[PDB]
Amino acid sequence: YKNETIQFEQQKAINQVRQRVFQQALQGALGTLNSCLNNELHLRTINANIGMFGAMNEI
Amino acid sequence: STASRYASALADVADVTGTLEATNSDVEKLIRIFSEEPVYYFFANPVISIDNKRSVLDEIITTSGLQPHTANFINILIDSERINLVKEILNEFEDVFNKITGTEVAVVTSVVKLENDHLAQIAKGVQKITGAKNVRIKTVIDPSLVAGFTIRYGNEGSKLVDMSVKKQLEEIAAQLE
Amino acid sequence: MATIRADEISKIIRERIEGYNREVKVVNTGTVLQVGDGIARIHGLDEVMAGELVEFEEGTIGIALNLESNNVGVVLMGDGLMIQEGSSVKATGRIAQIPVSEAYLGRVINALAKPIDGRGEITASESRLIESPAPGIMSRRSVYEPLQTGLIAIDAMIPVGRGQRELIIGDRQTGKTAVATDTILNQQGQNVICVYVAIGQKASSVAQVVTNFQERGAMEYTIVVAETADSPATLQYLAPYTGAALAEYFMYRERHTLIIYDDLSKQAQAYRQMSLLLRRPPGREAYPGD
Amino acid sequence: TIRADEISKIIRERIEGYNREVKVVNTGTVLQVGDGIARIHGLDEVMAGELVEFEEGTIGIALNLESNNVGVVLMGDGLMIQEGSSVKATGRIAQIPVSEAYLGRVINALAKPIDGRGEITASESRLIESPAPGIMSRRSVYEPLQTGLIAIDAMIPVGRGQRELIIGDRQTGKTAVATDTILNQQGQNVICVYVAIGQKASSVAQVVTNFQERGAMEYTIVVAETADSPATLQYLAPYTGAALAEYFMYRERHTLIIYDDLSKQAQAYRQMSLLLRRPPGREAYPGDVFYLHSRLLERAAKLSSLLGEGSMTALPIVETQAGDVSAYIPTNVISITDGQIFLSADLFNAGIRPAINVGISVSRVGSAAQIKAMKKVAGKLKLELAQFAELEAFAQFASDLDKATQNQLARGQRLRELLKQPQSAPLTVEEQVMTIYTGTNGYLDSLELDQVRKYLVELRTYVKTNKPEFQEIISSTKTFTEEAEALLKEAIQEQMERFLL
Amino acid sequence: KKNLGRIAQIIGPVLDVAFPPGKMPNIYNALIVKGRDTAGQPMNVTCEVQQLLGNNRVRAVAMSATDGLTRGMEVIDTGAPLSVPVGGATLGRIFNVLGEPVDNLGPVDTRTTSPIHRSAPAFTQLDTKLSIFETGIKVVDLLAPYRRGGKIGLFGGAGVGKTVLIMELINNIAKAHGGVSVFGGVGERTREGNDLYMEMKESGVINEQNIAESKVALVYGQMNEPPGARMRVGLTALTMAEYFRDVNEQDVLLFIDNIFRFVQAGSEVSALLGRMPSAVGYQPTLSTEMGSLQERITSTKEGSITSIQAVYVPADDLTDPAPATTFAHLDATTVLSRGLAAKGIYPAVDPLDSTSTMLQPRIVGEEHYEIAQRVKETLQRYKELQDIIAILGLDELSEEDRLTVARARKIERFLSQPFFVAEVFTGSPGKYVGLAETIRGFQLILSGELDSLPEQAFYLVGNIDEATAKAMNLEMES
Amino acid sequence: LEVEAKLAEGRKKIEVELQEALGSLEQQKEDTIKSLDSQISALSDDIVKKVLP
């Protein structure tokens, strides 16, 4: 049972550090999307999600 | 609601009238009129002499020049003391107008104040997706919209459809998954 | 007017827009604005006097319960699945009339002053008010007379009085109506008009004692007033007043006469259901005070 | 423990396939939140009973698709949730995920881990209220669920699939009555549902400690709602256990549920509709609690062989509030339950846990799943207990109790000693029918009855060593053979000398 | 062009539906959502149109479960009361409350469907004979002679085996009555419903072969039913029974349970409906509802309706307004004690507490009602004796007091007799105890002939001869 | 008595050894939480890049 508990601790740290670096990567992506050429990348993505809106719409 | 019923009846009056636009104009004008918290209180205090309030009511019916169907609607309304329950029925008149219309106001919310062409594409796509007769576009250039947008649509703004940091929420989910 | 202004929207608030700076009278027809389960809130009929019948548009006698401001709560005497929303109940005006003579004697009358027995319509040409007024103390003599219970313990213990007002508290199958039945048999020689009122009894058992009374021939002396339980609590609660009207026809016909009201505790729960059917404030075991 | 290595693989691998798929997300501004109840302005797409989620992640099931807002039973608390936050109408209707994979793990009532072992996947997403075991869909509860409680499982037979109340007073090891049933549930291929509904989380932790040292938590699933739950979490975790039961149950296994207790859950639903100001009924329960119980209790069946003969042996604890059988909770609780198992609080005051007031207890299938072993081992015991009550009715008169009176009185007093066990001691069905034939033999009359404590135990031990083949007779053949009874009598006289020794 | 109103508001099985403002459906009109599951279009929301709310909206009793019900879903209203597969199509068919087969047999022939919101049989139209019905059980023969053609009920607390005594009643009367039998499991623990289906098969009352010739029909709404589902399940059972009693004009053996649970369902249903719950939990509607229940249950002249029903007499409160309200409308309520099963009597009827319309010397026979009143007052004196017996004990009592005490004790013990199917708990094969052998046993007991036979020997002893043999066993036992 | 003595001793010794195992995995996973901030920065690039569809 203690071995099972140790592997539970192992999985706990696995998900823990996974979430930690997930938050770090998220912060990097956040600064990036802030830094994006606003109207340009937003217009690319805007027509993109407009087409995706139409894609969900035909659905 | 019975407030929504009062709105529905005002819209019905304006609709069998045809004054849905005209009493809608009256609705906006009287909304800004009753927006005056002193006017809303003076019309809405129980201490108000409804004689003197009816005097001031026809005075205000002049002072914005209301259409007659909505005028008698206000007369029945303040007559039935739901003037105390006034304003949101007024607000509901807007939706009742859309209930008359099918012009669906949907709030977009993007990183930028987006393209009116992109607005046209989204309103057209929502006129298909909503299946709408028309679409009152209700834009927003949202700050927390990272790059993408957020169109609250539907009966409420229930039908949210957003790609701004929403995909980042999905990515954090699949990370957590 | 949280109830009325909701369904006013389609017509009556459209009417209110239509007649705002205008003071009007729809004061005869309650278009049945709200309606639930024998209880209606009919918009209008304001000049309907209190207590009147209300000729429902489908055909039903709404009993006058409470005049609210816009609509009014009315008690349907009948099965109002027929009536549609906004049905113009005309005010039927006759405020609790009662087709009253001796014509129903020898007949099991239904609560509508109609015969439940199928002995045809009792040609009872008078109209005693069903909600009748009462016998004043000046209008009272003392009950000088003895009444013949036949229950020798009863008339030994408690003197049965012509005119008098005794109540029999009992038990689930006391069979207390059988004591009343033999009283009617004692009344079958007593030159007294006899009434066998029956609220919510087993209509099977109502027919059992009805056969026993017919076989007794106290059903000659008796009419049978009958409203079994599945009928309206309009009828169930109210029917005692109807028996009182028939009795006062016999009693302003000066006769020795006696009535047998089979449990009004049934009618008590019936009017309790009427009170909650009014959605009014009820009290001790959901009774109103009144 | 080096998760540092393949993290660049796994994090990007989850970002691989980050589809972030797009459907029309309906939502509501929670207009007026209060007491787990929502006026959600919006969520016009009110598919009724769908679970929706506040912007604080607060789950909620639809309680009222209202004409103005949507009234929502906010599952859990929205103590950090401000008004007007967006509840995404998530569409998935009460579909908590069920698989066998949640086993060995304490579940928090929202299917979260109250284990603390971490998360676990589950493939099915059972809607927490689905239809119950249909008339054709059931079959006979022919198979047993040998309870391990001595004259229960002899007398009041817990069956595979069955339903029986366990009424009893204050937590008396009433908890331990269920736990000692669960120790037997190690040996079956039965999924055990340790529904500790709203219990003392200290004592619940004790229960889990005992379960896991007992290890039948392998064969079990601990449904854990702390006492300080949401009253809705209390008012719905029954349905969660119902779904998790249905998993192994519609996996055709024998399965067994143990609710402890619906009474606290009755208080919860009382509090819930009470917070709604829905006008409650007799003894302040709202009415549908029984219906909620009928939502609860009507699941359990040894299902059809057409369905697959899956047994769901639910049996709940039933709190005896002052022994008031006309508690509306108990009043309903009997009305559903095909068996009613009333405990002995006086014998609990006599410490005589396993303490069962056997006369007031009842079960419809007393021997249809009690073995020919068990029935032909203990029908004499049943009438021996009944006549023990009979010669126990008013034995305070005769003043020299004859060997008729006194020998039946001390035989049944010995029976009163005999059903008694140390708690958590699930004895063998072998040892069960063994002590059954022992009392049927009556030979332990000469025990100064505390002698029977070591005597019956060592007799089981000497038949354990010597004639375990007779245990194979009593279990394999499972009919009270006079070969098995012969070896039992041989070992009985043998241990009679050996305990005379 | 039936009105497909939108699903206006949904809370509980009362859904609001916005019908057309012209075309609102009737009161008690059936309805159906266009309907869905996740799995396709489960259109299953048939609905009982309760109250014309107005503003084109109306509150209604949906006859099913309410999941996924989108606010605004189009319910085409049937505009009419619900019709059920009445008649001999149901004979064999375990019918659902929906009229569908709960048997999962074939879908029954829809030729005889019927509006269960139906009229009651008139006082002109009712049959009027005070014929008793034979029992085979001890006080069931004796004290409350069950009347032929009548709603004989049994008020009992939970865990009575109202199930049990009802099923033994079913076992005897089913083989006995050649009239058509209709059982309504209503909120029942459908484990016992499955037992009942197995038993009808086992009896041939489900003659499975010639399923039309089962000649006993099942209508089950299980415990898991919703309350509006549990509302008119009895109405549908009554409707098919009315096909039997009018269309078939057959003798309506008609058992049903639980009516108190039916009342509880209507109570919580009106709690959903927005109407003020009048009694302790009960709806105001409870009165005329249970009257309408008992009123269809009138023994018609075409078919008299021997309608055995049961009251889950809750909390042992007879003065619960459910059992109070029932105590009028039933014709013969067997009052089942909890206490005599603490004495172990199966059946545990307090025969003191039950009462028969059929109880008369002119009805039962003067010998029967004479010995019956003798035994009844023996019981009454015994109960009065119990007071002084309790604290003081019988040593202060008199010897005539002890004579009456052991005498009525013997009466109570001989009132215990086994029941026919009752073995599945206990083991005893019951004696279908006839009325006259019971009369002779009462004669011996109250006459003190049996006052040398033992009280414990009379316990669950069917005949006085069977008591004599059991006492011969006891007197042999030495 | 002596068998239960050595047996409870075995419980305590297996407890101490498992305690060593748990503390060692604690230090191991703590080091791993410290280890590969480089892989964490690979992820920092990766979810930003895969973030922008």
From Swiss-Prot, chain B:
The region annotated as signal peptide is none
Which pairs are disulfide-linked?
none
The keyword Transcription regulation is annotated on this UniProt entry: no
An annotated GO cellular component of this protein is: chloroplast thylakoid membrane
Its GO biological process annotations read: photosynthetic electron transport in photosystem I; photosynthetic electron transport in photosystem II; proton motive force-driven ATP synthesis
GO terms, molecular function: proton-transporting ATP synthase activity, rotational mechanism
Q: Which domain of life is it from?
A: Eukaryota
**Localisation:** Plastid, Chloroplast thylakoid membrane
Presence of keyword Thylakoid:
yes
Q: What's the subunit arrangement here? A: F-type ATPases have 2 components, CF(1) - the catalytic core - and CF(0) - the membrane proton channel. CF(1) has five subunits: alpha(3), beta(3), gamma(1), delta(1), epsilon(1). CF(0) has three main subunits: a, b and c.
Role, per record: This protein seems to be part of the stalk that links CF(0) to CF(1). It either transmits conformational changes from CF(0) into CF(1) or is implicated in proton conduction.
What family does this belong to?
Answer: Belongs to the ATPase delta chain family.
Name it.
ATP synthase delta chain, chloroplastic
* Gene name linked to the record: ATPD
The shown residues of the full protein are 73 to 249 of 257
Swiss-Prot record, chain D:
User: PROSITE patterns recorded for this chain?
Assistant: ATPASE_ALPHA_BETA (PS00152)
Pfam families referenced in this protein's UniProt entry, alphabetically: ATP-synt_ab (PF00006), ATP-synt_ab_C (PF00306), ATP-synt_ab_N (PF02874)
- Main location (coarse class): plastid
Top-level enzyme category: translocase
- The residues the record assigns to binding ATP are 168-175
Annotated family: Belongs to the ATPase alpha/beta chains family.
Q: Which PANTHER family match?
A: ATP SYNTHASE SUBUNIT ALPHA, MITOCHONDRIAL
- What is the name of the protein in this document? ATP synthase subunit alpha, chloroplastic
Q: What is the lineage of its organism?
A: Eukaryota, Viridiplantae, Streptophyta, Embryophyta, Tracheophyta
Curated annotation (Swiss-Prot), chain E:
* Highest taxon of the lineage: Eukaryota
Name any one Pfam family assigned in the record: ATP-synt_VA_C
Q: Which Gene3D superfamilies match?
A: 2.40.10.170, Bovine Mitochondrial F1-atpase, Atp Synthase Beta Chain, Chain D, domain 3 (1.10.1140.10), P-loop containing nucleotide triphosphate hydrolases (3.40.50.300)
Broad class of the protein's primary localization: plastid
As its record notes, the protein acts as a catalyst of: ATP + H2O + 4 H(+)(in) = ADP + phosphate + 5 H(+)(out)
Q: Which molecular function GO terms apply here?
A: ATP binding; ATP hydrolysis activity; proton-transporting ATP synthase activity, rotational mechanism
* Assembly with partners or alone: F-type ATPases have 2 components, CF(1) - the catalytic core - and CF(0) - the membrane proton channel. CF(1) has five subunits: alpha(3), beta(3), gamma(1), delta(1), epsilon(1). CF(0) has four main subunits: a(1), b(1), b'(1) and c(9-12).
Q: What is this protein called?
A: ATP synthase subunit beta, chloroplastic
Identify the species of origin: Spinacia oleracea (Spinach)
Gene name linked to the record: atpB
From Swiss-Prot, chain F:
Ranges in coiled-coil conformation: none
According to its UniProt record, where is this protein located? Answer: Plastid, Chloroplast thylakoid membrane
Q: What biological function has been recorded for the protein in this entry?
A: F(1)F(0) ATP synthase produces ATP from ADP in the presence of a proton or sodium gradient. F-type ATPases consist of two structural domains, F(1) containing the extramembraneous catalytic core and F(0) containing the membrane proton channel, linked together by a central stalk and a peripheral stalk. During catalysis, ATP synthesis in the catalytic domain of F(1) is coupled via a rotary mechanism of the central stalk subunits to proton translocation.
Q: Describe the subunit structure.
A: F-type ATPases have 2 components, F(1) - the catalytic core - and F(0) - the membrane proton channel. F(1) has five subunits: alpha(3), beta(3), gamma(1), delta(1), epsilon(1). F(0) has four main subunits: a(1), b(1), b'(1) and c(10-14). The alpha and beta chains form an alternating ring which encloses part of the gamma chain. F(1) is attached to F(0) by a central stalk formed by the gamma and epsilon chains, while a peripheral stalk is formed by the delta, b and b' chains.
Family affiliation: Belongs to the ATPase B chain family.
Q: What else is known?
A: In plastids the F-type ATPase is also known as CF(1)CF(0).
- Stated name of the protein: ATP synthase subunit b', chloroplastic
Task: Give the lineage.
Answer: Eukaryota, Viridiplantae, Streptophyta, Embryophyta, Tracheophyta
Instruction: Report the gene name.
Output: ATPF2
Range covered out of full length: 168 to 220 of 222
